Description:
This is part of a larger assembly, with 2 copies of chain A.
Chain A: H1 2-11
Subcellular location (chains A, B): Virion
Protein name (chains A, B): Genome polyprotein
Organism (chains A, B): Watermelon mosaic virus
Amino acid sequence: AREAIAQMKAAALAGINSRLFGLDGNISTNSENTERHTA
Amino acid sequence: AREAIAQMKAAALAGINSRLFGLDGNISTNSENTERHTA
Lengths: 39, 39
């Protein structure tokens, strides 16, 4: 049975790419403006 | 008659090869695979 177990564990895991990062929360698509308006 | 009996017993047994074994039950024409399949 020691063989058959390892065959199961290996058969049920393939293609799963770990990729320890998820996604970052910090977005900056465009920097902050910091300018004014007048008439 | 002691002679004639022994002649019968010897005449009626010839070519019979004893061969105390019959046949074994254990067959192994090809060993057991123990491998998997995936897509």
